[PDB]
């Protein structure tokens, strides 16, 4: 019943003391933190506490949208040699640093996921040519579904896939995705392997990655310019912003101290130094 | 009155009994006691096998040594108990398995000895690689060092042999072996054996995972990391030595999907 | 007019949205439907119907009528498999083309129990006892009856009742398995071995066929709708 926006426990006025009770003495061998408050050690007056923990609630701590990835696509001229650039990105929070570390404060989580799409385009070649306002399809390809090989192949029919046709210039795109995990919680860290190396099998056949569950965990997004070739080249950058809503978490873990290296927990050399120089007897 | 103390503890599981006269109470991880799967959270349809007394008993892992040189030590559960009586037998015989533990670490000395050992319990204790070229490259055979377990190192030394990698964990002590400052290791359930005070660490651990029951062969639930917070010191000596012994007891263990035995390639 | 503020997402078209929109033919007299026999309400309903499995997909037997026939014989008893099959209904060539798999090919995740049914198609006089077994994953796929017999199985006797059914009980680490080949969501192994042997008297065909069927169970479900690969339009 104690909500987030509740006033914190008050400070009780306590006077001088000379008794056989020892708030001050403990033993951190027990693993337990000694739970004291100012009054326990020094004389205090009465204080009606006003501050609340309101903002520090798990839900509020993740209430911000965050850039997960930057997908780049383009629409070149018809005569061109290179193909029209259409991107495919494996949906994961671990491509960027910020949001990841925040999510790493715990062992597991559940959250309905909100994605936002900020598209931004421009020309590239020195020319005064023209491009009419461009549209963009963002097709979510769940694991196993046919990944588009061309920018104009059958896959874009999306008879079952959930897509979003964004018209450039209008407000950023947004879609809601519930907790879609195969487990009873999303796993930030997975101490194990997908395969088991059997003895009646060759090492190769039984080998897999350390820390990985399913290579394809959530699927890929596919983004393409819908409008056809235009004599003047136009490149586009779609920025995805994720805001984890309705979030729950379990078992806290120490926050990442050294820079990330790969999708794993691994650390690169040359970054193994986080704390600076400070003399013990210097304030 | 009758003389009941926090230091004096007698734990009993099956046909094994652990006593102690210098304890510092006991730790129930996240306040939850280990338990059997409730119909509400059940997942596999078959009748689960609960070995009970057959597997729910203390198993002593070979004793390691502590010297001024020691950086650290680590194990994985259920991994560590992979070859402990029926628990292992049952473990290898089923596709799924969930178990909790009563971890008791033993390390005594004299009132003239000094130091501190932090036995940490980390659910999903992922450790870091040894290559500056290949992420997440530690091979299964090095990921699961059984009852002998592993250690922590004082320096990160990359593996350069790209002709045949060493594929092991290089878990830097101060980084708790996972890129985070050791000083924060207390967020995990823990006890610190500080020689002058106690002589043992008892950490009861419930089953913790993202799934109700999971493949034990493939995945380790908990992690037991022991690193000397205070280095070992004895008298005016240059080479002191005292042993550390780990006895872990699986609790409320249940296994589903009975099939032929898995003979893993451990070497 | 009522003061409003346009929010993120406006003007965007979700192919999976569910909004109201204007009608092209206002007041259109819709013809009433009639009671057309056999109405379906859910895809799973079709999934529970037994469908014949093209087991033997040899280069010489694939894409023909021969694929569904698994031929047994009166050869002496051995411990070698008649047929092996991996539980990955939507990704294993054999299962992936049965009703179940097809429906499964439209979803990302599947869960529940499955049941295989085997139909003997020999002469009345032919007898025998076979063993069909489902071994959960995480170990060596059996190659001898000795191992297979250690898992989940049914010992079938060929007789007056010609069909036998072995249920594959939903035993998995995750609450839902991927509809693609994946280690993390592996399914195990389905195997069939001769329990005794096939015995036939004189003047009797010494070899015959068995037909396999598969179907989901009342507890089975599928989620996260997706596009299938079992069809395409090249240009």
């Amino acid at each position: 019943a104690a909500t987030s926006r509740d006033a914190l426990p008050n400070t009780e006025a306590s006077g001088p003391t000379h008794s056989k009770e020892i708030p001050a003495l403990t033993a951190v061998e027990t693993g337990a933190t000694n739970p004291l408050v100012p009054s326990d050690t020094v004389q205090t007056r009465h204080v009606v506490q006003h501050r609340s923990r309101s903002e520090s609630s798990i839900e509020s701590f993740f209430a911000r949208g965050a850039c997960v990835t930057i997908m780049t696509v383009d629409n070149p001229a018809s005569t061109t040699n290179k193909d029209k650039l259409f991107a495919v990105w494996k949906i994961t929070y671990k491509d960027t640093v910020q949001l990841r570390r925040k999510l790493e404060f715990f062992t597991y989580s559940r959250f309905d996921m909100e994605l936002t799409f900020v598209v931004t385009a421009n020309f590239t070649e020195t020319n005064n040519g023209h491009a009419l306002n461009q549209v963009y399809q963002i097709m979510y390809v769940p694991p196993g579904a046919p990944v588009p090989e061309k920018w104009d192949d059958y896959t874009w029919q999306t008879s079952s896939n959930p897509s979003i046709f964004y018209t450039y210039g209008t407000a950023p795109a947004r879609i809601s995705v519930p907790y879609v995990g195969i487990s009873n919680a999303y796993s930030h860290f997975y101490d194990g392997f997908s395969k088991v190396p059997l003895k009646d099998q060759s090492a190769a056949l039984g080998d897999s990655l350390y820390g990985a569950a399913s290579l394809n965990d959530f699927g890929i997004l596919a983004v393409r310019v819908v409008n056809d070739h235009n004599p003047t080249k136009v490149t586009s950058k779609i920025r995805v912003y994720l805001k984890p809503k309705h979030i729950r978490v379990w078992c806290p873990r120490p926050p990442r101290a050294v820079a990330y290296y790969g999708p794993g927990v691994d650390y690169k050399d040359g970054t193994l130094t986080p704390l600076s120089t400070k003399d013990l007897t210097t304030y | 009155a009758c003389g009941y103390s926090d230091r004096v503890l007698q734990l009993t599981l099956g046909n094994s009994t652990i006593t102690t006269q210098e304890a510092a109470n006991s730790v129930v991880a996240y306040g939850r006691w280990p338990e059997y799967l409730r119909d509400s959270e059940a997942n596999p349809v078959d009748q689960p096998t609960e070995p009970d007394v057959a597997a729910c008993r203390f198993y002593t892992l070979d004793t390691v040594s502590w010297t001024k040189e020691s950086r650290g030590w680590w194990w994985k559960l259920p991994d560590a108990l992979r070859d402990m009586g029926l628990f292992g037998q049952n473990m290898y015989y089923h596709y799924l398995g969930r178990s909790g533990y009563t971890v008791h670490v033993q390390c005594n000395a004299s009132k003239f000895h000094q130091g501190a050992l932090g036995v940490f319990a980390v659910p999903e204790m992922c450790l870091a690689g040894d290559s500056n070229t290949t992420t997440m490259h530690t091979s299964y055979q090095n990921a699961n060092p059984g009852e002998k377990g592993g250690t922590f190192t004082g320096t990160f030394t990359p593996d350069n042999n790209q002709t045949s990698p060493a594929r092991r964990f290089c878990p830097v002590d101060y980084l708790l072996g996972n890129g985070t400052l050791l000083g924060n290791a207390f967020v995990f359930p823990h006890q610190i054996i500080n020689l002058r005070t106690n002589n043992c660490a008892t950490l009861v651990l419930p089953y913790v995972n993202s799934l109700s029951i999971d493949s034990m062969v493939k995945h380790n639930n908990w992690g037991i990391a022991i690193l000397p917070l205070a280095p070992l010191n004895f008298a005016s000596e240059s080479s002191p030595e005292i042993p550390i012994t780990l006895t872990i007891a699986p609790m409320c263990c249940e296994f589903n999907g009975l099939r032929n035995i898995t003979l893993p390639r451990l070497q | 007019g009522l003061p409003v503020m346009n929010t993120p997402g406006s003007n965007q078209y979700l192919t999976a949205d569910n909004f109201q929109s204007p009608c092209a033919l206002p007041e259109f007299d819709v013809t009433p439907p009639i009671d057309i026999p056999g109405e379906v309400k859910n895809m799973m309903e079709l999934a529970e119907i037994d469908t014949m499995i093209p087991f033997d997909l040899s280069a010489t037997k694939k894409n023909t009528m021969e694929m569904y026939r698994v031929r047994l014989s009166d050869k002496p008893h051995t411990d070698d498999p008649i047929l092996c099959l991996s539980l990955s209904p939507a990704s294993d060539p054999r299962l992936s083309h049965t009703m179940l798999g097809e429906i499964l090919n439209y979803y990302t995740h599947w869960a529940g129990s499955l049941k295989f049914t085997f139909l003997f198609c020999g002469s009345m006089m032919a007898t025998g006892k076979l063993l069909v077994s489902y071994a959960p994953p995480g170990a060596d796929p059996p190659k001898k009856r000795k191992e297979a017999m250690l898992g989940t199985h049914v010992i079938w006797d060929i007789g007056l009742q010609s069909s036998c059914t072995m249920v594959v009980p939903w035993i998995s680490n995750t609450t839902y398995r991927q509809t693609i080949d994946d280690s993390f969501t592996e399914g195990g192994y389905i195997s069939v071995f001769y329990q005794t042997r096939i015995v036939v008297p004189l003047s009797t065909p010494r070899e015959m066929d068995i037909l396999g069927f598969v179907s989901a169970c009342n507890d089975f479900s599928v989620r996260l709708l997706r596009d299938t690969t079992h069809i395409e339009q090249k240009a």
């Epitope: 991107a87 495919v88 990105w89 494996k90 990944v147 997908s194 395969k195 190769a204 056949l205 080998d207 897999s208 990655l209 990985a212 399913s214 290579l215 394809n216 890929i220 790969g262 999708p263 794993g264 | 290559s131 070229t133 290949t134 992420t135 997440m136 490259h137 790209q162 002709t163 045949s164 990698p165 594929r167 | 080949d181 994946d182 280690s183």
Partner: nanobody, 120 residues
Framework: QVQLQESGGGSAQTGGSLRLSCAAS????????MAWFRQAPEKEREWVAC????????YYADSVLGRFTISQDNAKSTLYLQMNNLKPEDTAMYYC?????????????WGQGTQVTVSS
């Protein structure tokens, strides 16, 4: 648009050697593996060999052991399959399956493939 395009041909005499290459693009998130697969004329698609992300740690198929060599050049973002001692069993199509992996089986990107023929 992770474009995987094989090259290397396939029309050698029995016993020779060929260099099977594969141009990779798009976003190959290094970490994982990169490999080779063969379908054969009339058999099931079979795994040939897999090499680690950037690491030169690899394995080979029992059938091809030592007679095939799979490397990489992540500077040139390519993978190579040198094949010495080609034989009548090696006659087949080869595919550069280099994406995700994590092992020697999982994929989200394949190529168009190329045929090899060891004649004699």
């Amino acid at each position: 648009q992770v474009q995987l395009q094989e090259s290397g041909g396939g029309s050698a005499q029995t016993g020779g050697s060929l260099r099977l290459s594969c141009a990779a693009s798009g976003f190959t998130f290094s970490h994982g593996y990169m490999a080779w697969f063969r379908q054969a004329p009339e058999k099931e698609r079979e795994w040939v060999a897999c090499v680690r992300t950037s690491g030169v740690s690899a394995y080979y198929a029992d059938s091809v052991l030592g007679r095939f060599t799979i490397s990489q050049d992540n500077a040139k973002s390519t993978l190579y399959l040198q094949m010495n001692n080609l034989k009548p069993e090696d006659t087949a199509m080869y595919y550069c399956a280099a994406t995700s992996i994590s092992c020697s089986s999982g994929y989200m990107f394949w190529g168009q493939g190329t045929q090899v023929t060891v004649s004699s």
